[PDB]
Design a protein around this nucleic acid. Sequence first.
RNA 1: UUUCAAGUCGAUGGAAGUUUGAGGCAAUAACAGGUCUGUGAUGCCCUUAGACGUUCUGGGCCGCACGCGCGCUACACUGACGGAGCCAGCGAGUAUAAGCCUUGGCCGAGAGGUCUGGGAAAUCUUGUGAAACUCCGUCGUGCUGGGGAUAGAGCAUUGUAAUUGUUGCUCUUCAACGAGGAAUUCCUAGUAAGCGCAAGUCAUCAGCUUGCGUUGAUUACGUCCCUGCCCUUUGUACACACCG
Lengths: 72, 81, 141, 144, 129, 140, 102, 55
Amino acid sequence: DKAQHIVILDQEKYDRILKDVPTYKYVSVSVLVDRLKIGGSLARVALRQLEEDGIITPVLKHSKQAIYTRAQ
Amino acid sequence: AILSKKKKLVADGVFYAELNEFFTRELAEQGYAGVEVRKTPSKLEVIVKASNTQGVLGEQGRRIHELTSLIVKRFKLSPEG
Amino acid sequence: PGVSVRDVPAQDFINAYAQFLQRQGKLEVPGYVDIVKTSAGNDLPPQEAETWFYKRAASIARHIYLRKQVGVGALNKLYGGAKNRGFRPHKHVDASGSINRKCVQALQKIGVLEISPKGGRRISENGQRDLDRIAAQTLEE
Amino acid sequence: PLVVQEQGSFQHILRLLNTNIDGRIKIMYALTKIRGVGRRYANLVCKKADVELTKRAGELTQEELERIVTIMQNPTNYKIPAWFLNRQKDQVDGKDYHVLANNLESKLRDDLERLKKIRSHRGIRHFWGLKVRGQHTKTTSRGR
Amino acid sequence: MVDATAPKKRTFKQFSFKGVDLKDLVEMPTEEFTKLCGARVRRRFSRGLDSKPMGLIKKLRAARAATEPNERPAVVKTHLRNMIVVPEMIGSVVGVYNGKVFNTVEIKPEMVGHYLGEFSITYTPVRHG
Amino acid sequence: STQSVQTFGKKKTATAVAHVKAGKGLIKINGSPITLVQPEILRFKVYEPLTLVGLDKFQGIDIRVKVTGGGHVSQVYAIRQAIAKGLVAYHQKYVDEASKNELKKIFASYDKTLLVADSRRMEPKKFGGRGARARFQKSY
Amino acid sequence: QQIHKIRITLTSTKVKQLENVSANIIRNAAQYNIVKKGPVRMPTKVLKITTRKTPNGEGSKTWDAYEMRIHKRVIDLQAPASTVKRITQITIEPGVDVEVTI
Amino acid sequence: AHENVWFSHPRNFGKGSRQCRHCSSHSGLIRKYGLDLCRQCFREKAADIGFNKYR
RNA sequence: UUUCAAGUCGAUGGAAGUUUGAGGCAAUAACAGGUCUGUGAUGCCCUUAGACGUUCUGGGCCGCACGCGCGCUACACUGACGGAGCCAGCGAGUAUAAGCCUUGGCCGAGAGGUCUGGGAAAUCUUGUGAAACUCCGUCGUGCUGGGGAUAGAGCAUUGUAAUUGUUGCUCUUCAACGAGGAAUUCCUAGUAAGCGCAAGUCAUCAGCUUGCGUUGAUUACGUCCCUGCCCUUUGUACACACCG
Ligand SMILES: [Mg+2]
Ligand SMILES: [Mg+2]
Ligand SMILES: [Mg+2]
Ligand SMILES: [Mg+2]
Ligand SMILES: [Mg+2]
Ligand SMILES: [Mg+2]
Ligand SMILES: [Mg+2]
Ligand SMILES: [Mg+2]
Ligand SMILES: [Mg+2]
Ligand SMILES: [Mg+2]
Ligand SMILES: [Mg+2]
Ligand SMILES: [Mg+2]
Ligand SMILES: [Mg+2]
Ligand SMILES: [Mg+2]
Ligand SMILES: [Mg+2]
Ligand SMILES: [Mg+2]
Ligand SMILES: [Mg+2]
Ligand SMILES: [Mg+2]
Ligand SMILES: [Mg+2]
Ligand SMILES: [Mg+2]
Ligand SMILES: [Mg+2]
Ligand SMILES: [Mg+2]
Ligand SMILES: [Mg+2]
Ligand SMILES: [Mg+2]
Ligand SMILES: [Mg+2]
Ligand SMILES: [Mg+2]
Ligand SMILES: [Mg+2]
Ligand SMILES: [Mg+2]
Ligand SMILES: [Mg+2]
Ligand SMILES: [Mg+2]
Ligand SMILES: [Mg+2]
Ligand SMILES: [Mg+2]
Ligand SMILES: [Mg+2]
Ligand SMILES: [Zn+2]
């Protein structure tokens, strides 16, 4: 009951995402949920765009598992 | 009428089983051993093995004649068949 | 060498034929597609409301390509699945007849299939022509 | 088809048909909180109101919220099939209806006395709180 | 949600069953009546009415004709408890077998469309302790 | 006609019949290239008979198999056996047996099921239980 | 009504007499220069019936598993109808029944 | 009158619609392959019919 | 290794090296074990016309404060849905009936309806295009899109007859259950576990059995510690044999 993860993305969290995700060894749906406090559905759209924006390199593609890494 | 292969071989067996018990009840006193049904064209040969073939074929073969009639009238067989 | 339907993966070929069939727009879509569920064993309608009919018609077309005189009754069994009987064990139940029958009827007037002799629905003279075409525009990337 | 941001437009708590709806639930499953509105029914009223299901409850504007409650209260006027409705071939007026949050238990109740007033067997077992649909009660339903 | 109000209205309301009020309901023929009730009832009349249901109706009609000071129409007894109540037999009193006794019921208008034996429980309810 | 050999591989119920003809190296599964086998996690099970010997062995031969029966996984093992057995059987008939024994050595040293069909079959069920060995739970 | 493509269907429970009649007909179809096709072994059908052992309902739940194997063979002959029927009387056997269809 | 009531209830498509060849019983009937024999009567006649135990 | 014996354990070859895997049959006697509710199998007793025979109508065998046993669903993310991919084996099937398996076409959201045709069957249903499963999406730890009882309203099928809902379908309601105490069951390889399919009962109804196949392991390959049985020795005042 204590989760209360944020599902709407405001501006303070948005640039915090783009400031924190690059400094990650390994990002995934749970990694985004665990540390950014965002919901699972919001994490999935974030990963699919961050890959389209070039910040994130896709190590492996799968529906149930998305393995991503830093592009730097 | 039109009877399947599975249901036809079973019917022959069921006919044999019912016919065999019929002889056991009727010809019990004559040491009835068994019956062999030899199918043939235009005829249904039935061979009965008994200790005494006089009780079945008695008084000018009256009983065997009167006993084959009980099978034509129960299985709807032609009198010559 | 040439290209056939059998030379391309099934899952992404249907996604390509579905896209063409929607953009072409000539396929007639029945009016209840936004309401109905695909099977009586299903509990919810398809999640891709705008496109589920096109993709299913694409799947039906591809499945008929590889076989000979498949009926509409066989199509219900193919797309049917395990029903969620509450406490009783699961069982396979066929899909809806109208959805499949409308697709093949809709596909029959777009030119890809036709009623085959001795039952079923054959692929049309032009049905082979245009499916093999889509396969080529699938694998260039 | 990408992440977007908003400020001050989200509404945490909604009130529809005198029922409180959590605003952070997806719209299709938020309406299922309204009693008398299931997942199957909520999927169609959102599709009849041209409200794409990819929106949370708070994302909706007032214009959309009123457009949904209008459809739920008048389903047949929006090409919603009769067989899809909650209360079809009504007892008194014979028309197809879909009862909602506060109306459902009232007309559900009215059916119970209507069974009990004629003293039918089904109404009697309903009165006793036992199963009415022929279930065996010798070994099941022993809680309280 | 906008708003809601429930100001219920009337007009000397007569009891009504699926859009048909009691006045027209009773003198509708049972052929027409079955067309506006449930699936089970509609199937039963299409399957063909054997002599037993029709014979009870004829006796029930006569029992009402026996008395014309407008009191209760005297009891007709029957075993056929698979009878479907029709508007023609509203107000009649029937004795319905429960296996042992003739439970007596008076056909109220709200009983229409139900099975005749559904108002006569066949078992005395269990009472532990 | 031409140099054609026909073989088969088997798993539990799945049986894959392989036709190995002389040609440009055409290798299809039920009329579809092996590069698009549905079990992708297991796509390397049928790639093993290829990369073990080297794709150069398939320049002169084309293989078309028809696999039926069994299940999804059981069919993959049947296909890879028909291919492995087909390549060996072609060498024994149209190439020197020295090469055929060479190919058979690498295959056997890697996986016995490439050439030898697995003999395991399902045990029959016996009454008194829901399975072959399993029995209904007992109560006292 | 002369030389015909004629089918003889052989069914029986026991294979020894079935193969004797089958071989005897083939033998007679060999010395007589009659082209033949067969015999064709149809997949044998196992008629299985599984009852409970107990006439009552007491004891361990034990079951019998009875069987009735049915073997069916069809032989195709190219001969006039008079020739094939008399061949049947040559190879008549009580166990095996014969049906002839054109 | 009485003939229209005596044995008047339908006795088709039921368990009482059929009976054993041997014992004319209603319970435990075997209808496979048109045997129409009781399961108890079948065991005592199985060998005669041609059913044997092999496995 | 071994009494160099019976054998056992490793390799190699092999399709198969656990009795090759699995079953069927199965000794000398015995039990007051269970069935006279399988028998036109039976002795005796009871009844035999107001029947305890048989038949017809209706109800009951389902009845519900409770204790117990065989099971089925689940408690979620190794997952639910939504699309898409799409693979078995064991089997069964009719006529002047009293109606079998039913494709294909056409209606219907479904359930289901209708018109033709095939099959007495390796021919047609049927490749029974089964389900788990796999891919791509939605969901995002929430009694939540887990779970689907209970119940309201409605639509079809079978049947003379569905009320005490036969079953199926549609909408709605959406309960306990958040992995279970003391105890206790089954199991060693295509085995266990899932997962379905067919046959039996069957006008209708399979959460049941009998089989079949799909996916497919963990852990011993040992012991007498518990439990049961067998053998040897022993005691006995038991032999109807400790229910002595
Ligand atoms: Mg499927
Ligand atoms: Mg599916
Ligand atoms: Mg489930
Ligand atoms: Mg379930
Ligand atoms: Mg019960
Ligand atoms: Mg009575
Ligand atoms: Mg053995
Ligand atoms: Mg005793
Ligand atoms: Mg007695
Ligand atoms: Mg008795
Ligand atoms: Mg007895
Ligand atoms: Mg007696
Ligand atoms: Mg008796
Ligand atoms: Mg009994
Ligand atoms: Mg019996
Ligand atoms: Mg009496
Ligand atoms: Mg009982
Ligand atoms: Mg009751
Ligand atoms: Mg009761
Ligand atoms: Mg049991
Ligand atoms: Mg038990
Ligand atoms: Mg799903
Ligand atoms: Mg799925
Ligand atoms: Mg077939
Ligand atoms: Mg819930
Ligand atoms: Mg659910
Ligand atoms: Mg429910
Ligand atoms: Mg124990
Ligand atoms: Mg029943
Ligand atoms: Mg069944
Ligand atoms: Mg049972
Ligand atoms: Mg011990
Ligand atoms: Mg002594
Ligand atoms: Zn019997």
